[PDB]
mmCIF file of C-alpha atoms and ligand atoms in Angstrom:
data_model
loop_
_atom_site.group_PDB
_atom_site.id
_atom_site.type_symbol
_atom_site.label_atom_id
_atom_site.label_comp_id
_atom_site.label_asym_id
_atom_site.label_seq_id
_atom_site.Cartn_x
_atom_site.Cartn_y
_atom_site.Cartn_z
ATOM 1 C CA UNK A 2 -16.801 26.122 18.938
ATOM 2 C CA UNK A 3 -14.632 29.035 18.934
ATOM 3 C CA UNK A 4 -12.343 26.971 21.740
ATOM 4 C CA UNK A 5 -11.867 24.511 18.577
ATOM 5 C CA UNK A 6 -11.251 26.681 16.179
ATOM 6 C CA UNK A 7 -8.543 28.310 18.065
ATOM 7 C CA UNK A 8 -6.859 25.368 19.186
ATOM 8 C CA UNK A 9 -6.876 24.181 15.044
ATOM 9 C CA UNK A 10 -5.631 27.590 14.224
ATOM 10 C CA UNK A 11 -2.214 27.571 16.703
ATOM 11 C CA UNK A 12 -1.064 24.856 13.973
ATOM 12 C CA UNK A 13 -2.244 26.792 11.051
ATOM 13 C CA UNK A 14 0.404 27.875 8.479
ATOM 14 C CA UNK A 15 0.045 30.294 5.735
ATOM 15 C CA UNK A 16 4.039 29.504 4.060
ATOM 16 C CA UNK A 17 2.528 29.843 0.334
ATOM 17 C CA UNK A 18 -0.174 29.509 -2.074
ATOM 18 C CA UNK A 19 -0.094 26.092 -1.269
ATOM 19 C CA UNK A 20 -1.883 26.846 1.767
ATOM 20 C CA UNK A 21 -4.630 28.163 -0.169
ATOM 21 C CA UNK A 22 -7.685 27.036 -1.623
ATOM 22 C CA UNK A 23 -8.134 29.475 -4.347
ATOM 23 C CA UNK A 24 -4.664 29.986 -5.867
ATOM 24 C CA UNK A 25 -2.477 27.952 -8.301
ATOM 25 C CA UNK A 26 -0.377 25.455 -7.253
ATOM 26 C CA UNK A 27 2.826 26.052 -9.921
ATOM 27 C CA UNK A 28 6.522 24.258 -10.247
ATOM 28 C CA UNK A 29 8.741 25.488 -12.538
ATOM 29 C CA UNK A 30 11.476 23.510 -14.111
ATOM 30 C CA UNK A 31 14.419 25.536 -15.564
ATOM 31 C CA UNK A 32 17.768 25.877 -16.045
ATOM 32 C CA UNK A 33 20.600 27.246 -13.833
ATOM 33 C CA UNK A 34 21.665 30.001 -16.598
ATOM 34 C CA UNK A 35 22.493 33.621 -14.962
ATOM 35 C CA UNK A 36 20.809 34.998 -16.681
ATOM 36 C CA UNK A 37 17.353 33.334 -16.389
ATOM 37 C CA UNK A 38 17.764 35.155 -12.556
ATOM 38 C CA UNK A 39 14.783 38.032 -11.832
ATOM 39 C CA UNK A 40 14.602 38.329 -15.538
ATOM 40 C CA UNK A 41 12.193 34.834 -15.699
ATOM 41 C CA UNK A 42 10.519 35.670 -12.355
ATOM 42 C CA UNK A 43 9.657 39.062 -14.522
ATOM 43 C CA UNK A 44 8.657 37.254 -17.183
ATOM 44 C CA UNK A 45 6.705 34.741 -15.705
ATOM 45 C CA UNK A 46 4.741 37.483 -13.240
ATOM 46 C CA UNK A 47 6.195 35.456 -10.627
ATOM 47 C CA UNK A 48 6.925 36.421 -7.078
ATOM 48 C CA UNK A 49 8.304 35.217 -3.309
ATOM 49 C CA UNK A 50 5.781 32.174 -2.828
ATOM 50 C CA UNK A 51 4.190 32.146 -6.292
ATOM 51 C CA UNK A 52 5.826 28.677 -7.315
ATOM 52 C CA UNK A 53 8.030 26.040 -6.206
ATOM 53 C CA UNK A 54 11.482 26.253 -8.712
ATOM 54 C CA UNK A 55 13.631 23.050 -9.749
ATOM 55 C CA UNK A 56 16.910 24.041 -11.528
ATOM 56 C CA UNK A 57 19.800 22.052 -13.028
ATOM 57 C CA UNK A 58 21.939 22.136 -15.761
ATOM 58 C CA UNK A 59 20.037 22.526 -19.330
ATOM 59 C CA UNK A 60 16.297 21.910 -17.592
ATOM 60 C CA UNK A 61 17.002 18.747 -18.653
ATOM 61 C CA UNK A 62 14.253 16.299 -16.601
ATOM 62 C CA UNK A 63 15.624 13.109 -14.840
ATOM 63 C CA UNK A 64 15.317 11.288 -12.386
ATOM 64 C CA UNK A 65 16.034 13.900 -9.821
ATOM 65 C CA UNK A 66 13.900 16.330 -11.281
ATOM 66 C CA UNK A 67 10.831 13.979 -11.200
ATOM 67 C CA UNK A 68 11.233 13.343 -7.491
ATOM 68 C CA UNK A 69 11.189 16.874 -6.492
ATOM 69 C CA UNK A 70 8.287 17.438 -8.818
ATOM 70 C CA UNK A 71 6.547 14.484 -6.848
ATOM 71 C CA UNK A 72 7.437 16.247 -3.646
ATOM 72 C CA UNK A 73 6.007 19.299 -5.162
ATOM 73 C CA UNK A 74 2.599 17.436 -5.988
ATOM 74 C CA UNK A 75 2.086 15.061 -3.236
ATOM 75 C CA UNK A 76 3.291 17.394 -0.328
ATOM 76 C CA UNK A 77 2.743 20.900 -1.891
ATOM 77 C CA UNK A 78 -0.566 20.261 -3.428
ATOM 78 C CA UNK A 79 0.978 21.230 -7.196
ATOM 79 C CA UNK A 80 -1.216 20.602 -9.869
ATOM 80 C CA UNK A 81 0.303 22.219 -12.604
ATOM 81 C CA UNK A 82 3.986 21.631 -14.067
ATOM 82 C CA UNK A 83 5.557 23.943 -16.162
ATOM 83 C CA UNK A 84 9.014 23.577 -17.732
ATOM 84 C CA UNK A 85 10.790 26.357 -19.301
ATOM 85 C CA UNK A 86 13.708 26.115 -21.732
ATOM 86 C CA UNK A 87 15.775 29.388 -23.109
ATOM 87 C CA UNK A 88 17.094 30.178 -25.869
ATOM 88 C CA UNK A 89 21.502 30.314 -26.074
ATOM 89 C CA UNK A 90 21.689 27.398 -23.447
ATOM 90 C CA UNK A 91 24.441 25.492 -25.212
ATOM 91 C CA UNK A 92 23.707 22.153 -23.480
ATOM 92 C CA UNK A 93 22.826 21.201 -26.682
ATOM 93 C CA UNK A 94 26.411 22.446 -27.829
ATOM 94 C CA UNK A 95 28.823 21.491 -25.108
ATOM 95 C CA UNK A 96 32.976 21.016 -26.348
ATOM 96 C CA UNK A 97 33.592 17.174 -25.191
ATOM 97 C CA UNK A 98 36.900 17.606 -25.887
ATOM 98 C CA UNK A 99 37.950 20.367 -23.983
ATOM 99 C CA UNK A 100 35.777 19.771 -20.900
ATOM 100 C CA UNK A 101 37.603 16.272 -21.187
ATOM 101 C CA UNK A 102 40.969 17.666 -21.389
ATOM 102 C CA UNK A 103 40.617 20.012 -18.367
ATOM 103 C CA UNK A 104 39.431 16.658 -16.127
ATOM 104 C CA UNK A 105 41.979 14.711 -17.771
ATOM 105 C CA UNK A 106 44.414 17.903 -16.563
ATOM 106 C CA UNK A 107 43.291 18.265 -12.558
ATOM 107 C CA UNK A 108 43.841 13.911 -12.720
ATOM 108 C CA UNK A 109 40.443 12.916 -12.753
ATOM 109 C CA UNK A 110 40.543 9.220 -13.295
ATOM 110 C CA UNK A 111 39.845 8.293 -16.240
ATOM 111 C CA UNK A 112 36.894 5.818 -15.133
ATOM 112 C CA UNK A 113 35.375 8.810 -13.954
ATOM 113 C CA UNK A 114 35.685 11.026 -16.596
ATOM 114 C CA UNK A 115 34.051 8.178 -19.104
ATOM 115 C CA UNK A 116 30.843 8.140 -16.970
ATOM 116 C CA UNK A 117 30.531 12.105 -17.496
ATOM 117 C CA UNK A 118 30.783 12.094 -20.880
ATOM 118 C CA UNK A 119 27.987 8.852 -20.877
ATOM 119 C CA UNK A 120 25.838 10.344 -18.807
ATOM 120 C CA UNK A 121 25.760 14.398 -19.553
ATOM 121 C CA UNK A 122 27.612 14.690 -22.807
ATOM 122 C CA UNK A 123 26.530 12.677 -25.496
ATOM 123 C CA UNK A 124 22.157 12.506 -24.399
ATOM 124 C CA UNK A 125 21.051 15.688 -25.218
ATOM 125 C CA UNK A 126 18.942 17.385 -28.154
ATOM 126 C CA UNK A 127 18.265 21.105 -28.525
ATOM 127 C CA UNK A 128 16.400 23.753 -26.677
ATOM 128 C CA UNK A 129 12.929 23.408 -27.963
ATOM 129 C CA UNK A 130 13.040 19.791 -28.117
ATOM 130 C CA UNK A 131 14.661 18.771 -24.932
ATOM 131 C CA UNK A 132 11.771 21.097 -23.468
ATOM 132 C CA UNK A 133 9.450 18.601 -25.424
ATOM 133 C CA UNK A 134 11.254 15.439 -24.677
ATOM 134 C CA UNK A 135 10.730 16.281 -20.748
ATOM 135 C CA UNK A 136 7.291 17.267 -20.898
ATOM 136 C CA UNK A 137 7.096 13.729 -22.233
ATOM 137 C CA UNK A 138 9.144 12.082 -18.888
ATOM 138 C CA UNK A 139 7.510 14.232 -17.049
ATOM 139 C CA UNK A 140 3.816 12.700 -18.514
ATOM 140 C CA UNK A 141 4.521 9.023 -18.786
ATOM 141 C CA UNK A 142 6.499 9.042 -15.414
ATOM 142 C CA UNK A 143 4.049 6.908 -13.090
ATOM 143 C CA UNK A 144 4.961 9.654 -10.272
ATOM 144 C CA UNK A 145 3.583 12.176 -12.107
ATOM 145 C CA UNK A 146 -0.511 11.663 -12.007
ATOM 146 C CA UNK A 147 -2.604 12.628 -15.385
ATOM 147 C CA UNK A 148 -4.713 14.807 -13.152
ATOM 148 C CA UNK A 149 -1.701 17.142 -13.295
ATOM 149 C CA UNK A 150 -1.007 19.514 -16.408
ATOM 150 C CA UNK A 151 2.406 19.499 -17.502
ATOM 151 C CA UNK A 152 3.418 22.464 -19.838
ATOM 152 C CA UNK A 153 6.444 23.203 -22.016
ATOM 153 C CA UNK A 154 7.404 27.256 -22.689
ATOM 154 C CA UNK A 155 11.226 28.385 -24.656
ATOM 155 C CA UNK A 156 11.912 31.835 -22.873
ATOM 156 C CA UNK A 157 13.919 33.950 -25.104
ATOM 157 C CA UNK A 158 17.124 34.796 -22.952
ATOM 158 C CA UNK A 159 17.445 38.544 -23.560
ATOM 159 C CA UNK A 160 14.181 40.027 -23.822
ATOM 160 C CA UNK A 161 11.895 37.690 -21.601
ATOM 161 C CA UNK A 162 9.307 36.323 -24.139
ATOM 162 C CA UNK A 163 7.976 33.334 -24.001
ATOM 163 C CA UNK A 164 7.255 30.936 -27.004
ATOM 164 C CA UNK A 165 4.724 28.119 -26.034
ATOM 165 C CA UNK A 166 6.115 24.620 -27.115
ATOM 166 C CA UNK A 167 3.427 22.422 -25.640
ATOM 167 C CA UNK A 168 -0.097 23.355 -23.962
ATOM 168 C CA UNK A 169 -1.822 21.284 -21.674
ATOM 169 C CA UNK A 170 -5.048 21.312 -19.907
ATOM 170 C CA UNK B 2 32.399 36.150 -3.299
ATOM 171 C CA UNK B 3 31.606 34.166 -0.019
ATOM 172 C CA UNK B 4 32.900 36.856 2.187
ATOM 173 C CA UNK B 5 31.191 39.649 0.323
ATOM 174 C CA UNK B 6 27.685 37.977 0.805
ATOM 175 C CA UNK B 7 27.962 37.300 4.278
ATOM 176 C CA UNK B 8 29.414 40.918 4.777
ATOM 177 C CA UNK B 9 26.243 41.928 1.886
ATOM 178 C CA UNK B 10 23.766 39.813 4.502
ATOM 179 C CA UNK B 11 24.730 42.304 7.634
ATOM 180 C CA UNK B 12 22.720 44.487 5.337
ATOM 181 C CA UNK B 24 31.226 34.417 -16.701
ATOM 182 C CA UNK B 25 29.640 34.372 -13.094
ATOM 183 C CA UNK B 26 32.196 32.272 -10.965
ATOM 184 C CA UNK B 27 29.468 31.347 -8.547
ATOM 185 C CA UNK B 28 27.467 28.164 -8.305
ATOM 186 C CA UNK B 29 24.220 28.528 -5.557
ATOM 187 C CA UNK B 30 22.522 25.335 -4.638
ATOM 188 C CA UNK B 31 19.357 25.680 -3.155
ATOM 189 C CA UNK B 32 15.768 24.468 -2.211
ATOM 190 C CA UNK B 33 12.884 24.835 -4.566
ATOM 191 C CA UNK B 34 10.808 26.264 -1.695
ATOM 192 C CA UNK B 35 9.105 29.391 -3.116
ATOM 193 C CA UNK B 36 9.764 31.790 -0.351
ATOM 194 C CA UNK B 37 13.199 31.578 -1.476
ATOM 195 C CA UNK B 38 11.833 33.308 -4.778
ATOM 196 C CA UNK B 39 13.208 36.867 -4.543
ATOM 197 C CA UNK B 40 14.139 37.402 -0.546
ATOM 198 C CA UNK B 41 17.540 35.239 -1.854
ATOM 199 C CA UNK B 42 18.656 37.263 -4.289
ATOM 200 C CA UNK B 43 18.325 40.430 -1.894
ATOM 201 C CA UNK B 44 19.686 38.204 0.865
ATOM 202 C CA UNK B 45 22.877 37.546 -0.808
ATOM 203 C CA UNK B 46 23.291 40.519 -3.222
ATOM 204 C CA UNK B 47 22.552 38.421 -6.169
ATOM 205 C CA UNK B 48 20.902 39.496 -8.869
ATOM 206 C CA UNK B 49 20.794 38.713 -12.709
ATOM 207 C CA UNK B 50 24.028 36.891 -14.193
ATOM 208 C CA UNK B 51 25.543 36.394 -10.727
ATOM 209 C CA UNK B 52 25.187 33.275 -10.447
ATOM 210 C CA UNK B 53 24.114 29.613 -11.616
ATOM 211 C CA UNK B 54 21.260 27.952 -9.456
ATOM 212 C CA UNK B 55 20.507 24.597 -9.082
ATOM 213 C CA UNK B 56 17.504 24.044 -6.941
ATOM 214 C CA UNK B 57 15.592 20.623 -5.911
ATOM 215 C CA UNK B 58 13.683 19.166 -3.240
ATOM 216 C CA UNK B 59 15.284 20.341 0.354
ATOM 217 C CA UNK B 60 18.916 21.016 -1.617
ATOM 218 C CA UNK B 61 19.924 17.662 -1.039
ATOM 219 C CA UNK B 62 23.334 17.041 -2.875
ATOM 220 C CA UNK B 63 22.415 13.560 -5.276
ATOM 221 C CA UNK B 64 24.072 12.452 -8.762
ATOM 222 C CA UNK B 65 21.915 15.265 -10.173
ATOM 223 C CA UNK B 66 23.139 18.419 -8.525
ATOM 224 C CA UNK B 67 27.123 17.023 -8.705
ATOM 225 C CA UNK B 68 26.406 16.443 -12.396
ATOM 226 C CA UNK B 69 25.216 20.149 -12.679
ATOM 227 C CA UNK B 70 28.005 21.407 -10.713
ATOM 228 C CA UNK B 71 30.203 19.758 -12.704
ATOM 229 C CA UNK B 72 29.188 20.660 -15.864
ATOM 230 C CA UNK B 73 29.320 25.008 -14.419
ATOM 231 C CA UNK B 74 32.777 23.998 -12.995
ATOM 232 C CA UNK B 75 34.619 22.555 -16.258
ATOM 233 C CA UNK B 76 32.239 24.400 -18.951
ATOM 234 C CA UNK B 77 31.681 27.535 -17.681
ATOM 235 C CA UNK B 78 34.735 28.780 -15.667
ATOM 236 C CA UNK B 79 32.881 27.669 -11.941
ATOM 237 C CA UNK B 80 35.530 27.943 -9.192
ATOM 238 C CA UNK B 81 33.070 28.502 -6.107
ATOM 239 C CA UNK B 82 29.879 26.557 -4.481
ATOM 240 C CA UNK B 83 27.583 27.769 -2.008
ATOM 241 C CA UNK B 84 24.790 25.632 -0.851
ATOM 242 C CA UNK B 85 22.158 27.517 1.625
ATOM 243 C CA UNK B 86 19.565 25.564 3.237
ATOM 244 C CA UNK B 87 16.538 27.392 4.689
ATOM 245 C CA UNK B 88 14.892 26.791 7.964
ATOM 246 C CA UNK B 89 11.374 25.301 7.665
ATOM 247 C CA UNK B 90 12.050 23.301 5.480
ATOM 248 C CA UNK B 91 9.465 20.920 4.137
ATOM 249 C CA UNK B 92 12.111 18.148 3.313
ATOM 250 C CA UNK B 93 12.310 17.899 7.116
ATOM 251 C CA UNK B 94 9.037 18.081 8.692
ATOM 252 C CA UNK B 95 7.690 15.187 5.934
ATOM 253 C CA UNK B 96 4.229 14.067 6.817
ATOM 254 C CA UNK B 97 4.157 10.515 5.205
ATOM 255 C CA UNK B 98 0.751 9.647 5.798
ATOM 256 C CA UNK B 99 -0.275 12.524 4.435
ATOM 257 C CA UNK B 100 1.161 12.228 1.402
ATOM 258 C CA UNK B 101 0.185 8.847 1.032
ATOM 259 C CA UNK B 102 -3.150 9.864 1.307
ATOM 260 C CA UNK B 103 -2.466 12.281 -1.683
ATOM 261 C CA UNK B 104 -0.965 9.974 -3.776
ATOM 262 C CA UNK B 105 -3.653 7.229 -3.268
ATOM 263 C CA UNK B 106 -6.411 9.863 -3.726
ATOM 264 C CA UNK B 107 -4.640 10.670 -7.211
ATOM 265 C CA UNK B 108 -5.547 7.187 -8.294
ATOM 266 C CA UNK B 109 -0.923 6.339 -7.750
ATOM 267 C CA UNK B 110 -0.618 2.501 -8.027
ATOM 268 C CA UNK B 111 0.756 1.072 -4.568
ATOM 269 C CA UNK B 112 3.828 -0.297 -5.984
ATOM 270 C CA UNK B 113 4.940 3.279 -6.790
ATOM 271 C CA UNK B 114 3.663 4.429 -3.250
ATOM 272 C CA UNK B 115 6.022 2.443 -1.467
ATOM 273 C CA UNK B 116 9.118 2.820 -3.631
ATOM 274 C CA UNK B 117 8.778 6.370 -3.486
ATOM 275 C CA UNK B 118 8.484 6.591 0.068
ATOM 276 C CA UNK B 119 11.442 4.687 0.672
ATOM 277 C CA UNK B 120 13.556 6.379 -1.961
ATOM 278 C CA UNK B 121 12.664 10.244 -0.664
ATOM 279 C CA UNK B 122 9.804 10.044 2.500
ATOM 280 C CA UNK B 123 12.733 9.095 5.189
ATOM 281 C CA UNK B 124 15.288 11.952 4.368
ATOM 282 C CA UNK B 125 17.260 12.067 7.713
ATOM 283 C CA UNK B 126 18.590 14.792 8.836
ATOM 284 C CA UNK B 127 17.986 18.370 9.806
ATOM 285 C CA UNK B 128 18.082 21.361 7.731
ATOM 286 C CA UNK B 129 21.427 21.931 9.224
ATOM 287 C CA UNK B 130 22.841 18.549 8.783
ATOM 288 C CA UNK B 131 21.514 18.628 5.331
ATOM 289 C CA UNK B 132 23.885 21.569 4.557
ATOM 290 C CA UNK B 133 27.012 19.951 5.889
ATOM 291 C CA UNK B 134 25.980 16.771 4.268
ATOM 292 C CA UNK B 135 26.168 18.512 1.450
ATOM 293 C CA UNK B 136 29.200 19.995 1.684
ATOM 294 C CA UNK B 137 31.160 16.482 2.134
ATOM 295 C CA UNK B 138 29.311 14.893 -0.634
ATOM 296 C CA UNK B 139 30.624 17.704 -3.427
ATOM 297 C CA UNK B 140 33.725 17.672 -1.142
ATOM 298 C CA UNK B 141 34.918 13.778 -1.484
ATOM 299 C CA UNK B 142 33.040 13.944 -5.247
ATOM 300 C CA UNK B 143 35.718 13.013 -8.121
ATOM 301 C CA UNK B 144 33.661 15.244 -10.140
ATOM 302 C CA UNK B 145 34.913 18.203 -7.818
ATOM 303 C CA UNK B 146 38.371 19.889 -8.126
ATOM 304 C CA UNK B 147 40.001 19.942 -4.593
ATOM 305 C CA UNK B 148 40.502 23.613 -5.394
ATOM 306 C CA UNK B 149 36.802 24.767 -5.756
ATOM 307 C CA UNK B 150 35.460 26.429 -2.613
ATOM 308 C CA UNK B 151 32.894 24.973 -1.235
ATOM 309 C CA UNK B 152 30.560 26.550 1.570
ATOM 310 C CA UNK B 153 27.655 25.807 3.570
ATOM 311 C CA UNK B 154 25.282 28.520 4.860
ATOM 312 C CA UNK B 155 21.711 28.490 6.287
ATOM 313 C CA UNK B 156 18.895 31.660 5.736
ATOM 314 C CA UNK B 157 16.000 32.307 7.907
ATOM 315 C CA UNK B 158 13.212 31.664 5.481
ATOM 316 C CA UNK B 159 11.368 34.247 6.863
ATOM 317 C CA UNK B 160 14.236 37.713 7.799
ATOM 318 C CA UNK B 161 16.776 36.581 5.350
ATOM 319 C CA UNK B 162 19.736 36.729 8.261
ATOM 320 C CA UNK B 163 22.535 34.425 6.891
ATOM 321 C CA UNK B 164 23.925 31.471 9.521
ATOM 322 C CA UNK B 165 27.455 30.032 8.320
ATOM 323 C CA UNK B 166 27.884 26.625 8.980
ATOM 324 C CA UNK B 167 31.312 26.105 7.104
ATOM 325 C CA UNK B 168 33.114 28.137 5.006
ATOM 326 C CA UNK B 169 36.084 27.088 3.064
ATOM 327 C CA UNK B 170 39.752 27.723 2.764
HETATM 328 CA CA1 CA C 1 0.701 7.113 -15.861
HETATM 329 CA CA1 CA C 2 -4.766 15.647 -17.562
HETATM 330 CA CA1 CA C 3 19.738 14.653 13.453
HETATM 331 ZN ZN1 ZN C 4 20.606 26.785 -20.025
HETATM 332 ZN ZN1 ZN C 5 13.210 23.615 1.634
#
């Protein structure tokens, strides 16, 4: 048997605690702030191979988002979601105007330019509810299965403490 | 910064990263590259493939908060290109996943194509040609040994 397990064990690969049996299986949705860098790792107690980590502009959870996640479940073995919003993010305070004057300024046609402001401007609420309103994608997304708990935290930017917004499990 | 990371690599931010969400990235990038707390933005997804998503991010560091310089580093090992369909078919059936959404989904992200290499430079036209993208933001494309760190430019800009 030994000549067996061998054989299995040449294709054997500990990358992460995905690999594992015992060990969670976290993603972490967040935003692409500075300043969330080592300071939420920190926070979190979270390490190199601790937790798969989606980041985009405002951890705001679309399409994009939910497709990694799935990639996260179905090929990492995550079980557990957790999204985490901070406080000063300001994609719930963006100046329309003057990010459409500066487009309007390098030439960017004008067709253009109206999609932006559709599609990242004008659908947005604030921190602790857009944390909400994705938990909510996130759990009536038919990618995402029940069987997987989806949490939302607000992280306070400067001193690292979190402020649960929704608990599951 | 470009040249000081690669130079860094040997061994208010102005600096967009665009990664994977592969957790041995967690921590060995930030020593890789030098970066460290309000250095940067990050996006991350799924095997840092460039989509609506990531350009709309970019775009929003870019004309909101004074972004003048992308750097997308792919990994190698990366599990966007060694895909095991029917295994995660098997997963998603197991999870009680209708089969509608089964086969939509692996049509829309099971068939990437591509190495992690490609993936990069892919990348690199997509934000390149992007109307979203001033023609004066650098844009690079580098690729990190997920296990040393050691820094492999595949195109750097300007
Ligand atoms: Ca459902
Ligand atoms: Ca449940
Ligand atoms: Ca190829
Ligand atoms: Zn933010
Ligand atoms: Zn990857």
């Amino acid at each position: 048997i030994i000549k067996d397990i061998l054989r299995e064990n040449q294709d054997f690969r500990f990358r992460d605690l995905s690999d594992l049996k015992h060990s969670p299986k976290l993603c972490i949705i967040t935003c692409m702030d500075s300043r969330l860098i080592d300071l939420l790792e920190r926070a979190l107690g979270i390490g190199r191979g601790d937790a798969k980590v989606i980041k985009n502009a405002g951890n705001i959870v679309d399409d994009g988002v939910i497709r990694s996640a799935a990639v996260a479940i179905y090929a990492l073995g995550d079980n557990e979601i957790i999204i985490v919003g901070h406080t000063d993010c300001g994609m719930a305070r963006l100046d329309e105007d003057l990010i459409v004057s500066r487009m309007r300024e390098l030439g960017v046609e004008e067709e253009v330019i109206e999609n932006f402001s559709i599609d990242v401007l004008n659908p947005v609420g604030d921190e602790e509810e857009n944390v909400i309103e994705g938990v909510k994608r996130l759990k009536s997304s038919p990618l995402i299965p029940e069987s997987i708990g989806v949490h939302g935290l607000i992280i306070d930017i400067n001193t690292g403490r979190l402020k649960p917004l929704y608990l599951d499990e």
